[PDB]
């Protein structure tokens, strides 16, 4: 199976796989059963922003999510990612629906990774920023039901012509270039990610969520990972 | 054939294809026969730096090259790249040798592209920076004789175990992700590139040079493009 | 008198000082009588964005302005700023009203300056970005009627408690640090600026406009520079 | 007295104020008596690089120092800087000598601060980068014996015409603009700093060190802060 590290914005409480009884933000290290969660006062139909940060000195994966006019929610987990992930990874966004549903619309996504060596000329970096997405967005790898270009956005899960979200949908978008997150000469390695999202549902119970993830470069949507599995995991182990 | 835009650091004067009678910097638009050149006082065995800049408002491709303790050389050419190149491109470095030879060593390479739309949330960007190159540099596409990791550098052309440059060599490195240089909503599009290089030769007449280039995403080394053709063109037309 | 270079978004046509007979964008080199203008289809009450770019290789000051859902307007002028401005400058935003009036609200302002030398370790930079402004914004120098913090914005000219713009008002904001735009070792010097603005008026004829400017470090609002003089010039010479 | 947070590169062991018995890197929170140290294998006459990082989610101040061809040293301390420092600060470099001495030469200094709010348009930033220093470096506030421009470097402490370091010297350089490190709407605040330094001494026992610091905006060199006090503290409390 793939190797997954993710920050989930989990909109539906699945209590038999350890979700708390409310929407939540969570840190997922090789399992859908988050290592750490925090309550998330999700707002149906409002644009939110999530921020993800990490560095190899402190070895703490942290995330913050907010809406305008609202307080934030935050979660952190102590983890040495160099012991979890390979040296080269891809980074992405994933989302799913099940029998319950929502739009999983991404309006912007940015990422920066840096590796500072002990050489004289120390810095190495990758950065991207998307504030719009074209029909043919060649620097994204789209998987499953993900599409780009409708209203200039990334729709991770299927939305009908009406604009209504569909159930039983799973889709991801990965940045095309592999990312180097460890190197033998690096003295500090760091990354940051931000994305803005619009989760809308006609229903009092939206599902299933959006995640930012980091994986093996060849990651693909696991069989049967609609719904609670967020397009990330093959099972709920 | 591929579509090529390049800035050449041409170390060998080939007077029958329009080179001036000295090493020179040049702007190449779909031909090895530069549209504009300037004299370049190349220094064998010293580390130099080249800078390349462009934006879609002014439609002027400009380059500057220097060494420490030396004056610079610069060239500019008025060209609307949106009329020359496709919407999506790859960017790279190329170099060659022929019967005359040199090392074509790259010590660092950075690039930034930006597209600013008329939306509210206007900016889109790609940036990379390499200050070292690993044996397995997964975010570069290496072509021909190019290798990475010897002394942490990118060697575009073949160097023997002795450290001696070989003749009759051609190699390129392209950044893995495609780059979006035009978009229908962009109000300003720009790019900048910098690279540092070490061209060394045991000979009074080094050849053939290094170029930064922008091409169709599927570009590949043309047959027979050793020597004067810089790994860029199939002929001297 | 101060030395001023500016890009004006001139909302009121003053035909006796050379304005065209419509709102316009203009490049001002030491005079309110723009060296170059272009028609600007200003939209009362909509948020717009302006972009300003320059580099010392090409010696062309260019600007673009747009609104969402609208085409852009652009202007360019060939000028060697090293012959106009001192080595160290301050950068700012200015606006005015007269007998005619408008709000001159700034919602964001960013700037980047870079100087690349011929040394090994070549780059020098300053960047700032404001997406909000506090009541006590210590890294801005406010002049005249400019205030910060109302609805988190920079109001360059006076607005009453009602939210109604006042006439006969002039205000500027300068970034606190001086900016180094020429240096003897620089091989390329560049800058870019962006700002977003909301110009609203209850009147069919708003006035007078907003400008981004670059000046001597000790610049101050000239006496009598309300109205057509944009807080920038002492007279219409 | 001023309020100081600093990362020290302490070259001389003063065992009665808690220094370990070797050169060390340390985190100083309102006292010269570091809260945390780590052994630092300082190399007389070689160029080193220090990196400092912090964010308000994790509340951990961390630093790494290295030389080419050498292993790094690192230190971290859990501290909420919003409880230590004011909302607006200045950032700087300081160094000292005493009866023992060294050069305290800075070859480059960069800094980035970011404040991400919960608004739509979330990011606010300041960045600077110096890779050279001019005789008249207007965006630095020089204190005590600090000078700029000799060999294009920042000499924090006095060096004679011979190039020999002097004893009993203290000097600092602060960036001119104040820096906003907390804001009521910020959901994440972060900073990073890097500097490269050359500490040389004709003596087997160099002293006293270099620090990166963050202070109240009006900070000044305390009386009698030569030597062990690093230009930072008025006493060894
Ligand atoms: Ca769930
Ligand atoms: Ca040639
Ligand atoms: Ca006017
Ligand atoms: Ca000490
Ligand atoms: Mn969950
Ligand atoms: Mn040529
Ligand atoms: Mn005008
Ligand atoms: Mn100490």
Swiss-Prot record, chains A, B, C, D:
Included stretch of the parent chain: 30 to 148 of 290
UniProt source species: Canavalia ensiformis (Jack bean)
Protein name: Concanavalin-A, 2nd part
Binding site for Ca(2+): 208
Coiled coil: none
Binding site for a carbohydrate: 208, 228
């Amino acid at each position: 199976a793939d190797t997954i590290v993710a920050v989930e914005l989990d909109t539906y409480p699945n209590t038999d796989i350890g979700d708390p009884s409310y929407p939540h933000i969570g840190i997922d290290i090789k399992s859908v059963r988050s290592k750490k969660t925090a309550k998330w006062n999700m707002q149906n139909g409002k644009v939110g922003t999530a921020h993800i940060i990490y560095n190899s000195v402190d070895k703490r994966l942290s995330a913050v999510v907010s809406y305008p006019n609202a307080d934030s929610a935050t979660v952190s987990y102590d983890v040495d990612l160099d012991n979890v992930l390979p040296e080269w990874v891809r980074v992405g966004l994933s989302a799913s629906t099940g029998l319950y549903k929502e739009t999983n619309t991404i309006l912007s996504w940015s990422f920066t990774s840096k590796l500072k060596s002990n050489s004289t000329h120390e810095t190495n970096a990758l950065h991207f920023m998307f504030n719009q997405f074209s029909k043919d967005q060649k620097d994204l790898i789209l998987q499953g039901d993900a599409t780009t270009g409708t209203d200039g956005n990334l729709e991770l899960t299927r939305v009908s012509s009406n604009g209504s979200p569909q159930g039983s949908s799973v889709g991801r978008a990965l940045f095309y270039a592999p990312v180097h997150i460890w190197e033998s000469s690096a003295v500090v390695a760091s990354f940051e990610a931000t994305f803005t999202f619009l989760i809308k549902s006609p229903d009092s119970h939206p599902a299933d969520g959006i995640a930012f993830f980091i994986s093996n470069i060849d990651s693909s949507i696991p069989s049967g990972s609609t719904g609670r599995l967020l397009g990330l995991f093959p099972d709920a182990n």
